[PDB]
Amino acid sequence: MQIFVKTLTGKTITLEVEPSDTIENVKAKIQDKEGIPPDQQRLIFAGKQLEDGRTLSDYNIQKESTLHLVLRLRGG
């Protein structure tokens, strides 16, 4: 039961999520590490916008399915 996330930063940052988890919890996990609102980030899969509030189980997400995490690294 593994999934895979690829951040726009290129750096390999991996996570462990269950089939019963919702992407809403997953986005929050990363946003918490950065202390930013989720409005500042977006997710895209199979050329479509990953809509907030869906589940891996509902969208039939398979193992090792890539998630493209796009956000703005607070710094500068």
Side-chain angles (χ1 to χ4, degrees), residues 11-31:
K11 294 192 303 196
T12 319
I13 314 290
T14 220
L15 56 49
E16 180 163 69
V17 173
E18 288 296 81
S20 265
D21 287 335
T22 71
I23 289 287
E24 189 179 312
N25 178 244
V26 186
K27 61 90 209 188
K29 192 60 168 60
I30 320 303
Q31 293 314 259

Side-chain angles (χ1 to χ4, degrees), residues 24-61:
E24 189 179 312
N25 178 244
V26 186
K27 61 90 209 188
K29 192 60 168 60
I30 320 303
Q31 293 314 259
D32 266 352
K33 187 170 78 175
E34 298 288 274
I36 47 167
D39 297 44
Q40 191 61 97
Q41 68 69 69
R42 60 265 286 244
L43 274 150
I44 174 175
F45 180 65
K48 182 63 182 294
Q49 58 186 29
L50 198 182
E51 193 88 276
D52 70 88
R54 210 148 298 162
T55 92
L56 299 192
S57 199
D58 191 84
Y59 202 83
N60 285 68
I61 297 295

